[PDB]
Amino acid sequence: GHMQVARSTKEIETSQSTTANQSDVDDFNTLYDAFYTNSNKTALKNSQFDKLSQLKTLLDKLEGSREHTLAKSKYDSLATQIKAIQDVNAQFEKPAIVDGVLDTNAKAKSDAKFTDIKTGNTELDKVLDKAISLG
Numbered sequence: 261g262h263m264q265v266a267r268s269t270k271e272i273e274t275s276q277s278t279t280a281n282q283s284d285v286d287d288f289n290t291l292y293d294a295f296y297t298n299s300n301k302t303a304l305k306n307s308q309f310d311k312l313s314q315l316k317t318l319l320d321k322l323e324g325s326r327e328h329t330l331a332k333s334k335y336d337s338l339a340t341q342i343k344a345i346q347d348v349n350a351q352f353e354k355p356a357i358v359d360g361v362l363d364t365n366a367k368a369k370s371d372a373k374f375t376d377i378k379t380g381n382t383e384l385d386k387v388l389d390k391a392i393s394l395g
Contacts, residue, residue: 280327288318288331295338296360302383303360306349309342341379348374348391362390 267274292315293299295308308315319335322328349355349363351372356363360383368374374392378385 276326278325280322280325280331284318284321284325285327285331288315288322288327289334291315291318292331292334292338295342298360300383301338302381303387304338304342304345304357304381304384305360306342306345306355306358309346312339312342315339337380340377341381341384344377344379344384344388345391347377348388348395351395352391356391356394357384357387360384360387362387362394364390364394366391366394368392368395 273279291308291311293301295304295312295315297303297305315335315338319328319331322331322335345355345357349357349366351368351374352363353367353369354363354365356366356368368391372395374395376392377388379388
């Protein structure tokens with residue numbers, strides 16, 4: 261076209277393989293940060309789990325970019341932490357890791373089949389566990 265835009269006035273990026281965008285990354289990281297009840301990311305909010313496919317979507321926004329890696333390693337991480345939560349919550353009649361904290365009020369179903377899930381998030385592992393300890 262006659263506009264001619266490039267990396268010239270779009271920050272100091274490009275020419276270093278593919279790279280993500282903040283409309284890709286920031287929201288990713290944000291919704292991602294959001295899955296975590298705290299920024300230590302040692303605990304997970306369950307309302308965010310519905311956005312895990314969205315976090316995958318934002319990671320999908322990272323898709324094709326280098327950030328994707330990092331962010332897949334964030335995403336997949338976060339996804340696992342929640343999936344873990346899900347896994348074990350999924351064993352209860354009602355989730356028992358909710359907001360990084362287990363629901364002792366939960367009900368480890370007759371279908372509850374727990375796994376010593378390591379998400380890499382220890383405190384989460386320990387809350388994952390928490391639930392399993394209801395099981």
